[PDB]
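Exercise 7. Predict the joint structure of the components listed below.
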Amino acid sequence: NSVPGAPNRVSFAKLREPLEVPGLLDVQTDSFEWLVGSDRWRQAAIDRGEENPVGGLEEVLAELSPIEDFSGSMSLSFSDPRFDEVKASVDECKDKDMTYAAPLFVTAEFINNNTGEIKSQTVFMGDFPMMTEKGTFIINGTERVVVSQLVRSPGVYFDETIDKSTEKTLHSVKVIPGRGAWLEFDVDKRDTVGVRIDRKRRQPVTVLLKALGWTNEQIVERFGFSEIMMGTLEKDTTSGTDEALLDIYRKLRPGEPPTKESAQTLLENLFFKEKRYDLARVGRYKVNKKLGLNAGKPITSSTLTEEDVVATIEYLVRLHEGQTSMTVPGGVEVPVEVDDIDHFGNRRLRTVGELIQNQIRVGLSRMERVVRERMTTQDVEAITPQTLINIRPVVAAIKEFFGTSQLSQFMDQNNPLSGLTHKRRLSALGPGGLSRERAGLEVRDVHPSHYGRMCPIETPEGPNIGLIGSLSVYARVNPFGFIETPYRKVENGVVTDQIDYLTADEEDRHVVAQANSPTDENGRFTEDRVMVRKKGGEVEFVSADQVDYMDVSPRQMVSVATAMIPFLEHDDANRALMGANMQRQAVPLVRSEAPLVGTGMELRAAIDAGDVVVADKTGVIEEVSADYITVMADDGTRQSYRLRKFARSNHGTCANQRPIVDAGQRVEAGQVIADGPCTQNGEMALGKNLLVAIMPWEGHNYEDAIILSNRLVEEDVLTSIHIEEHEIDARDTKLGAEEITRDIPNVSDEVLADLDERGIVRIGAEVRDGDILVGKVTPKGETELTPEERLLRAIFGEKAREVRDTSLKVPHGESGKVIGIRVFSREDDDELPAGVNELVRVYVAQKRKISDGDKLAGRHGNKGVIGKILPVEDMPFLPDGTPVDIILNTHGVPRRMNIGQILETHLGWVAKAGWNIDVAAGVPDWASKLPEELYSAPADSTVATPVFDGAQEGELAGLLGSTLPNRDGEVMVDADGKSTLFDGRSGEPFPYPVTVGYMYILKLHHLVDDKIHARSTGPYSMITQQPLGGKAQFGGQRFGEMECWAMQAYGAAYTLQELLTIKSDDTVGRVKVYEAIVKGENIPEPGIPESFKVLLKELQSLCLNVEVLSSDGAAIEMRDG
Amino acid sequence: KRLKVVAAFQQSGNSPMGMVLDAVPVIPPELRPMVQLDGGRFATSDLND
Amino acid sequence: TGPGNRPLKSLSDLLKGKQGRFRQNLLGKRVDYSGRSVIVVGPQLKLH
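Solution:
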């Protein structure tokens, strides 16, 4: 409907959508355009209610604008950040391995106070990286994504605990700032309020109050409503103000001789100054809201004040007493309660813009330090802005962030959904965040405040469970970093059309209904009792008058990946989690096919992913080809679109685009014009629809295994193209220069048959394992040859050349066809790194078919590796003669509580059968709520089943009973969804009917070709002479401590001894064993492992006299050789 | 506790003087290698520093 | 610490921990003549 060119997919939804899905990539683009300060962000801020909006760069420059020295005679100011045009386009940056950045210029002004002469110049600050139109950064030619970080907002947090030694309640409060010291107050067993400034020892808070300029009378008249404060004041044992200030100085800074002004300056520096304490705008807002201070005033100050401290102490004492209300003098009454640090009103989100802003702030601080250092050394009357500003730290910090930070990750490019979910990810790990080990079973929980803000299903199932999540579909982000969700406001039981975006704090005050509540034509609730959510989650039933808000859609709590699972409510949470995670792992096939049964989140997901090509302005097609599309327009402007063809993604898959338009066709602005990798007609298509039979079969699908038909291999159904890139560079060495040529001193002549004149393979030449791709050679120097080798070379005439072959060869277990060669040379003015003279990259493409060991999966968490690929005549077939494509076991469905697939199976059949409800004698009772367009459909039609509002069980049964016959006029599947299958290899029909249907299955990126590895002898390590590890290094398999325990329990002494000695560490033993095996003798006895000698040397280097003693009592030397 | 430590030193033929060092042993170089990674970049074992 | 505010590795750090000398290189090693691969089900095989 909304999308101009969209395929017709009828839907089972019975509820109207008041609010459409927002832009799925706004979470990144909005943050970055706030950081830069683009015009559209300024307009949006003005239209939302503004005073003076400022970007991140403007904010950091304003907070750093006055740079004055101690004398106060000189100052430097920065202003007016401006961005020029981009250095190069995205394609050029990715091809040439550049960075997609734009120049940054800041006007710097120097003021000399004593003479009054001012200078101003435009200073170049460097090439600031720029986000593309799809939310990614091209850094060094690679696309990267900055992941939003979930952190705890600065502010005051109150906590309560129960002591197990006295059974009394103890309260505490912590003030957590950003870039500042920590201030904690607590109440202990002795009812003595104690403050711990920084991380020092406890001191009664009366001392701190007196040090702030208060007297005994002030404390008495201020805290006269309590008893613990009086008890603490009576036991202070410190009179006056100077004594308390000296005590605080002595406790805080031991070893420093105190004076009168030093302590006051220290306190001001710690708490009441902008230099070393900064309660940020978020922290200032949180403190003001919590304590009820400065209600109405704009957020200008960002430092703690004595009013805040005294309000915190009063709040703590009144909370301990039991009062549920408090009004600070000159303040607004606020409730008194403890705070939950996991509440989404206490957890904020640092987007990409805020992280980049923090890095820029660090760089500017370093630059300011350098500037202040240079100011006092140079001569006055000659200082200019450009001779003081070292821009290098700022760009260095930005580069360090983009290349070292954990939150800047490689983009996932298995399919468009992978990237789309990657950009919408909320991570709790990184600098300033939690660690996967120091996180208990408290933050890895689904808090009731995550409803509509964070998806409770989609999260990793490994060790990072609960620490990584995804944004909901309708979730937005507050300017302060909090997550908002939309709700429809209702009044007097009438649901209005006004949508308000509320955060967790605002949501807790109101009571929110459910989007599935039945409403009349105007909005009046037909039923009195309504299901709602109260403050602490609290799912309850209330009357229709108490409700004041309603959800917008039934799927407000689910993310994009979780919203593409049909019949989600019929699947358990674990299986839905697995289904989403595996749906993110599908690989693109050579030909794509949209699912017969979907959820409707396929057009929007594919369009917002960006891998599809979308027309910009309405017009007509002029020229359509396999690699370019030309579009005319009513305005009179031609748009040319270049299509990516066989381009390697970050993970090796093939990402090529194909047009779906014809010459002369008239398109509209926004219409899809060319499909992407996993895209058919603009819809996401991650897998294939296959005929599935649910039955055991001879044990070949035993324990989650899968049986496939051979038709899939023959017809290239589950076939994928994988592209690998091999790069080699000829640098300059100390012994000489490295030359790329087809010389290769010691080889045969047929190896060099596929190499051209310049020593590189030819395009289209098939390469096997070990074949030479690029012929390189390096200087060798003078080496003493063996006499036998010299005699052999003299006999055969092959002169020994002082060059060593270092050609680029295809890795073990790899093959394919060469499709592309990219050559960079320094003599042609190519920006190669220092020392490198030549560089060459070769792309090898391979078509992989489905095979035993490959992992297939579904959208309902049902995964499995293929254990058998039967011939077509061995598969069970319908009485019509149609063989089934896949056989799934029965024993795995009921115990995993993911029967939604079964429902999908049934629906799938109807989708690829057509149906016609017999409306004779009125509409059937079971079809009362079906839309009028679902009463009849043709064959191969596609249907939509939204997540929590779709087809029901009764409708499914009715549609199973109402399907139309095949070409022979007979029905193959009865009303129960079962068919009478025949045995392929026997001919007798199976005694009982079997469930058959169509299921949409996905080919996951876990292939045996990337898993199989074996080794007999290869590279070893340096310090300890043990084999390396990993398939990419031809390494060995680790025989850990558990395997040693198993061997010891078995009693196999010799197997364990040989495994430890002569397969890992016995340097002489390895070669002796190889020689004995080759020549056929017995395996010799093991020696001494090298690791033991390394351990002995490491012990001796610690001044430990470790010595091995023989039976006599002497010392055995370890210097054999 | 003091008797435990003192009798530990008394039973063995060693002397407490070994707790104060006059010479520092240095590990063989191959256990703290200085290797040349491909491309000319070198590597250290953090013991050289 | 060295570059990147990473504390340097001493001899005690060599000898201690799960990644130390003993546990990582003496009680368990990497071996030759070993491979690794995905497992499927063969129902026609014998128990041996």
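Discussion. The interface with chain B takes residues 731, 733, 835, 1022-1023, 1094, 1097-1098, 1100-1101, 1103 of chain A (CB under 8 Å).
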